[PDB]
């Protein structure tokens, strides 16, 4: 019945050579997948060092992002810092500041965790409608990686901090300085200054040679190219936490600290960038789901657009405040779908639809956007992003 | 203790530790008037930011907006927006003009934020602005914030119970971001980034 | 004290921009880090295509390899298999042969591991003595990634395995083939046909778009390129497993079938390539532990050659027949030292001394060696690679 | 069952499984004799593997070593250590020669299979392998080998009790890899890819 001759006739690489073992010290991926990528949208700002790009999470699997595609947010450019130009100052309420070179950094006590970084903005663009198309750019300003580095409370503890000192500020190297402030029983559970992710040294625009880590809580807070911790009495309401990182309400005040990443999730295929081909049968729905206020506890899929739903299986493990995989295997028939996914996590917390969120918010939130996405799957196997009412 | 580090030097701490809190803890020694301020912003700042700090072409406004906060599309600046002066000082010392940061001295940046309150409709065209009389000013906005109460108003609302079966939800199709079309797009007019099509011959 | 000018003085990248956002859609690593890559030893082998390089364990942390860096073995060369020129065979005692195109396997239910991949051959040049400087030299034919793909039971059963298959064979697209046979039982367990690792698609060096996943067995076995899986009532006895990766023993007789990797652990640092160079005072010991045969239960850390040990702490978790990661922080006092780590894992075993596997196996097994590694730290922090008797 | 993936066609089976099993499952109806096999080889072998399949330079040898597998530096070779004729076959019809694979016949590979043993001294110089006899050969080293029992030998051993205080072993150097000095090193002599010294300038 008409053999194939991808089989039938012997192909080069079956008998020719491939490359050497001398050929690629440090590989990228094959030429194939040039489309895993980030992508940058130019009309979200003004200048693209102050500015975002995407992780592409509609082609990715699993839970660790590849740290050459994983997202960046710069306010003034990735800079170049090497470890000998390196310095790390703590002062204020301390009993002796300290300057600390990269090298002394290294001889610290150890420490990893695994969790996402999820851009505060992550969304955003959504809280008024269907914007963009493709979960890339609707779901993707974050990343997950395996981070190594030294806990804040013992860099601290070297400088002695002053009952007094209720406040951490921490800026970067970088023109931009993104300081913010945090409270001293968050910079003593679980703050990290990361040196390795994904088992190598941070990449250049994900702050080499060091960042904070800040599991649960928005990305600006994660300060990349950290250069001092300033322990101070009270926040110092900085830039970064005050015109920004703020959260304008329906009544015009603003909500201001809003730290933690609330549970989300998303559908990663099928969505706008990856359209069922394959004709009917079946189907694997894969997606991402993540929470600052711990581990993951279960993922709800709809095909109906929230009139019914199905709990899918965690892939692996729901670590807490990482990124936890999911997976729905159905027969798809060929109709439309509203697919959709809910998580919740450990405090008991149910993702919230978009209406929910604007029901108490309105729509000037900017931030904080963890509403339930809608795929309108058609016909054809092509996907839309859509809200439904 | 591991012995790890070395003191910071006075010179150090003074070069990098240049934060002003809300209540001027970090302020140093210095005045500037608006009319030095408006020559400074006129040579630094205006060539993004406008003779009259109103913003050009699509680069952040930093006056005007005042009562727009319950509008359809709010304009947040410093004077309708921003709760303290301080934040100003802070950030306009430390990370402005945008590409040249850390160019202004203490006096420069008192004036250009004496500058920057007239223009925002906040002082008068002959104010001093001084490390003595800073804290003397209350913005606009200054009572417009409040921290994170999800706890309060999200939480105990979305822990409830989710419906399973037979959900009485709405499921007409409202918003298509296909309507916007502005996504980056690869050749065929297709979202970027999207799955090769494996029917089709490989690049 | 003198200021330093790092700190008093404002540095470029404190005020001039970093590099934009849309400047690396697929970033590498910043250029200080340009040691952190794959070395390859030109004596080890006859061709460059049939030979083997090292991933640079000695400078990476945690335990995921990043890809770009993790080594390959190949016994033709890396070769080149588009996703649209891939098929997938099962044949031989099934009820129905079948062909899949890459597009059918992404429609199966998937799963995960995370899984470290060591070739038989790690540390094989050190059976007779000490040879190479380095851990990337002597324990760096060794990876560990996140991997998602579908179990081979699932492929099995829409072929329909036969009452009389009891062995699987699995051969490559590949000129070399690297035929290997499986007992069904393995097979049946968690053997996965991976298409991602790290979150995206395998490297072309690493089988790009489908490798098999073996956990704790011997990397040979992980087929890449992976083109058909053949079930017969026999192992096939290939090459693979006749002339190489069998185990010749004191009397002239040779082991075969040896499958599983036994318990093993390095310390990554202090080592060879990376010097103490910061002078007495605190000092971290890092390193890898690992095995075949399930779950790292605790790693002990020797400084005087084996007379006394101190048990070492993981740093993060200890997975399944996968890479961990552990530490001991002592304070040096600039003694000379030798420096061991000895691996236990959930069955009780023990890592053994390179001592203790010559008195039962002799110098020429080739394999399998598992011994522990002994790093001489001499007075001036300079570390070499030795024996000890 | 899913319902994915097609019917294999006969013709798709015969071309990818040319798997020999030390039975003979595999074989195809062909023969070889030694003469051919020695023309084949010359023209498509033996400027890696030597006239007399005994290596040239540091390519495999593929006959001598017969009695080695006990002395310090064994020769393992088709002859003194493989099991099974089975493997020859199958190993050189679908991956050699080394670069051009998967160019030789069924009667190719008989005649170079005959040639093999012919050069290993185990049959003589107008020998004929065929499908119907090639499970008569049966190879020196067919009884050599035993399937892992590290779990009797080894595992029991290995998880006694391990000694943690005053270790009553040996810690006099004996040997040192800096002696042989033959991995690759960076410019100034140290390991390739030894980590940079922080105090020194970084790199351009
Ligand atoms: C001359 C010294 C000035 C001063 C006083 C200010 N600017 Fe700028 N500015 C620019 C851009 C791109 C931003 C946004 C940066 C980001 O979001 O990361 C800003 C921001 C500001 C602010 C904050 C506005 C807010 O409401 O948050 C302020 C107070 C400010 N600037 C003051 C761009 C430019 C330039 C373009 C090349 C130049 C020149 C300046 N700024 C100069 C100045
Ligand atoms: C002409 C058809 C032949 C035949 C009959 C054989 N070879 Fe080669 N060979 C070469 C290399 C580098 C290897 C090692 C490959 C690796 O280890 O992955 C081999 C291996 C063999 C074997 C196996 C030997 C063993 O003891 O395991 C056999 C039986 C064999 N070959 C037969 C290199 C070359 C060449 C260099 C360019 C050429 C030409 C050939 N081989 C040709 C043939
Ligand atoms: N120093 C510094 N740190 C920073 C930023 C910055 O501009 N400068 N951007 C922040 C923001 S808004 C985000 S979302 C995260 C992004 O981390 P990434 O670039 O690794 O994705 O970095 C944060 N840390
Ligand atoms: N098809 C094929 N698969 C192969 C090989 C090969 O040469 N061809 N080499 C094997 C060996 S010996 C090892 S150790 C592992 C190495 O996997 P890596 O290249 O991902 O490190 O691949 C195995 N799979
Ligand atoms: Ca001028
Ligand atoms: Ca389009
Ligand atoms: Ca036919
Ligand atoms: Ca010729
Ligand atoms: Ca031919
Ligand atoms: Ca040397
Ligand atoms: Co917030
Ligand atoms: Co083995």
Same mark, same amino acid.
């Given at each position: 019945?008409?053999?194939?001759?991808?089989?039938?006739?012997?192909?080069?690489?079956?008998?020719?050579?491939?490359?050497?073992?001398?050929?690629?010290?440090?590989?990228?991926?094959?030429?194939?997948?040039?489309?895993?990528?980030?992508?940058?949208?130019?009309?979200?700002?003004?200048?693209?060092?102050?500015?975002?790009?995407?992780?592409?999470?509609?082609?990715?699997?699993?839970?660790?992002?590849?740290?050459?595609?994983?997202?960046?947010?710069?306010?003034?450019?990735?800079?170049?810092?090497?470890?000998?130009?390196?310095?790390?100052?703590?002062?204020?309420?301390?009993?002796?500041?300290?300057?600390?070179?990269?090298?002394?950094?290294?001889?610290?006590?150890?420490?990893?965790?695994?969790?996402?970084?999820?851009?505060?903005?992550?969304?955003?663009?959504?809280?008024?409608?269907?914007?963009?198309?493709?979960?890339?750019?609707?779901?993707?300003?974050?990343?997950?990686?395996?981070?190594?580095?030294?806990?804040?409370?013992?860099?601290?503890?070297?400088?002695?901090? !002053?009952?007094?000192?209720?406040?951490?500020?921490?800026?970067?190297?970088?023109?931009?300085?993104?300081?913010?402030?945090?409270?001293?029983?968050?910079?003593?559970?679980?703050?990290?200054?990361?040196?390795?992710?994904?088992?190598?040294?941070?990449?250049?625009?994900?702050?080499?040679?060091?960042?904070?880590?800040?599991?649960?809580?928005?990305?600006?807070?994660?300060?990349?190219?950290?250069?001092?911790?300033?322990?101070?009495?009270?926040?110092?309401?900085?830039?970064?936490?005050?015109?920004?990182?703020?959260?304008?309400?329906?009544?015009?005040?603003?909500? !201001?600290?809003?730290?933690?990443?609330?549970?989300?999730?998303?559908?990663?295929?099928?969505?706008?960038?990856?359209?069922?081909?394959?004709?009917?049968?079946?189907?694997?729905?894969?997606?991402?789901?993540?929470?600052?206020?711990?581990?993951?506890?279960?993922?709800?899929?709809?095909?109906?657009?929230? !009139?019914?739903?199905?709990?899918?299986?965690?892939?692996?493990?729901?670590?807490?405040?990482?990124?936890?995989?999911?997976?729905?295997?159905?027969?798809?028939?060929?109709?439309?779908?509203?697919?959709?996914?809910?998580?919740?996590?450990?405090?008991?917390?149910?993702?919230?639809?978009?209406?929910?969120?604007?029901?108490?918010?309105?729509?000037?939130?900017?931030?904080?956007?963890?509403?339930?996405?809608?795929?309108?799957?058609?016909?054809?196997?092509?996907?839309?992003?859509?809200?439904?009412? | 203790?591991?012995?790890?580090?070395?003191?910071?030097?006075?010179?150090?701490?003074?070069?990098?530790?240049?934060?002003?809190?809300?209540?001027?803890?970090?302020?140093?020694?210095?005045?500037?008037?608006?009319?030095?301020?408006?020559?400074?912003?006129?040579?630094?700042?205006?060539?993004?930011?406008?003779?009259?700090?109103?913003?050009?072409?699509?680069?952040?406004?930093?006056?005007?907006?005042?009562?727009?906060? /319950?509008?359809?599309?709010?304009?947040?600046?410093?004077?309708?927006?921003?709760?303290?002066?301080?934040?100003?000082?802070?950030?306009?010392?430390?990370?402005?003009?945008?590409?040249?940061?850390?160019?202004?001295?203490?006096?420069?940046?008192?004036?250009?934020?004496?500058?920057?309150?007239?223009?925002?409709?906040?002082?008068?065209?002959?104010?001093?602005? /001084?490390?003595?009389?800073?804290?003397?000013?209350?913005?606009?906005?200054?009572?417009?914030?409040?921290?994170?109460?999800?706890?309060?108003?999200?939480?105990?609302?979305?822990?409830?119970?989710?419906?399973?079966?037979?959900?009485?939800?709405?499921?007409?199709? /409202?918003?298509?971001?296909?309507?916007?079309?502005?996504?980056?797009?690869?050749?065929?007019?297709?979202?970027?980034?999207?799955?090769?099509?494996?029917?089709?011959?490989?690049?």
């Amino acid at each position: 019945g008409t053999p194939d001759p991808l089989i039938t006739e012997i192909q080069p690489w079956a008998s020719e050579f491939g490359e050497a073992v001398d050929a690629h010290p440090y590989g990228l991926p094959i030429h194939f997948e040039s489309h895993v990528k980030r992508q940058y949208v130019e009309w979200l700002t003004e200048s693209p060092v102050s500015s975002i790009n995407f992780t592409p999470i509609h082609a990715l699997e699993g839970t660790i992002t590849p740290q050459g595609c994983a997202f960046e947010r710069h306010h003034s450019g990735a800079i170049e810092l090497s470890k000998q130009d390196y310095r790390l100052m703590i002062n204020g309420l301390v009993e002796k500041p300290l300057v600390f070179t990269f090298e002394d950094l290294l001889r610290f006590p150890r420490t990893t965790t695994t969790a996402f970084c999820e851009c505060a903005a992550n969304g955003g663009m959504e809280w008024g409608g269907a914007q963009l198309e493709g979960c890339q750019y609707t779901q993707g300003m974050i990343h997950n990686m395996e981070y190594v580095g030294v806990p804040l409370s013992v860099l601290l503890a070297e400088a002695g901090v !002053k009952p007094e000192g209720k406040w951490l500020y921490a800026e970067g190297a970088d023109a931009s300085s993104n300081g913010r402030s945090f409270p001293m029983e968050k910079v003593m559970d679980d703050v990290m200054l990361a040196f390795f992710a994904n088992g190598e040294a941070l990449r250049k625009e994900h702050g080499y040679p060091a960042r904070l880590v800040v599991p649960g809580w928005e990305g600006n807070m994660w300060v990349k190219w950290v250069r001092r911790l300033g322990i101070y009495d009270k926040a110092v309401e900085s830039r970064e936490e005050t015109s920004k990182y703020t959260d304008l309400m329906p009544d015009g005040r603003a909500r !201001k600290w809003t730290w933690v990443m609330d549970a989300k999730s998303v559908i990663t295929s099928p969505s706008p960038q990856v359209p069922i081909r394959h004709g009917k049968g079946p189907l694997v729905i894969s997606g991402l789901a993540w929470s600052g206020n711990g581990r993951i506890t279960r993922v709800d899929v709809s095909l109906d657009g929230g !009139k019914n739903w199905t709990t899918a299986r965690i892939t692996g493990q729901a670590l807490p405040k990482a990124l936890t995989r999911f997976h729905l295997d159905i027969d798809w028939d060929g109709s439309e779908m509203l697919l959709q996914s809910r998580a919740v996590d450990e405090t008991g917390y149910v993702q919230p639809t978009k209406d929910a969120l604007r029901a108490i918010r309105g729509r000037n939130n900017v931030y904080h956007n963890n509403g339930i996405q809608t795929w309108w799957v058609k016909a054809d196997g092509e996907v839309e992003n859509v809200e439904i009412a | 203790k591991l012995g790890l580090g070395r003191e910071a030097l006075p010179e150090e701490i003074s070069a990098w530790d240049t934060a002003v809190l809300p209540d001027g803890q970090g302020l140093r020694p210095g005045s500037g008037d608006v009319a030095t301020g408006d020559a400074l912003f006129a040579d630094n700042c205006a060539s993004c930011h406008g003779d009259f700090a109103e913003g050009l072409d699509s680069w952040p406004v930093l006056a005007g907006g005042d009562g727009s906060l /319950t509008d359809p599309r709010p304009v947040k600046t410093i004077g309708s927006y921003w709760p303290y002066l301080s934040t100003v000082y802070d950030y306009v010392h430390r990370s402005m003009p945008f590409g040249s940061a850390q160019t202004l001295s203490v006096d420069d940046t008192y004036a250009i934020t004496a500058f920057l309150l007239y223009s925002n409709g906040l002082v008068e065209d002959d104010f001093v602005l /001084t490390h003595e009389n800073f804290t003397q000013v209350v913005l606009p906005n200054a009572e417009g914030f409040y921290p994170d109460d999800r706890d309060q108003t999200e939480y105990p609302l979305f822990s409830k119970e989710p419906c399973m079966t037979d959900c009485a939800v709405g499921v007409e199709i /409202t918003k298509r971001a296909v309507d916007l079309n502005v996504t980056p797009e690869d050749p065929d007019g297709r979202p970027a980034g999207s799955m090769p099509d494996l029917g089709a011959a490989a690049a």
